[PDB]
Amino acid sequence: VXERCCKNGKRGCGRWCRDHSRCC
């Protein structure tokens, strides 16, 4: 888990990515 942010880039940045993703 944690791929959506860096994978979607502009589409991955969000509250979930903010907590589960390193980028954004």
Curated annotation (Swiss-Prot):
Negative results: does not or very weakly inhibits rNav1.7 and rNav1.8. The chain holds residues 52 to 75 of 78 of the full protein. It is found in: Secreted. It comes from the Eukaryota. The modification Cysteine amide is found at residue 24. The cysteine framework is III (CC-C-C-CC). Belongs to the conotoxin M superfamily. This is Mu-conotoxin BuIIIB. Mu-conotoxins block voltage-gated sodium channels (Nav). This synthetic toxin potently blocks rNav1.4/SCN4A (Kd=0.34-3.6 nM), rNav1.2/SCN2A (Kd=13 nM), rNav1.3/SCN3A (Kd=200 nM), rNav1.1/SCN1A (Kd=360 nM), mNav1.6/SCN8A (IC(50)=1.8 uM), rNav1.5/SCN5A (IC(50)=9 uM), rNav1.6/SCN8A (IC(50)>30 uM). It is noteworthy that the toxin is 50-fold more potent on mouse Nav1.6 than on rat Nav1.6. The block of SCN4A is very slowly reversible. Expressed by the venom duct. Transmembrane segments: none annotated. The lineage of its organism: Eukaryota, Metazoa, Spiralia, Lophotrochozoa, Mollusca. Disulfide bonds join 5-17, 6-23, 13-24.
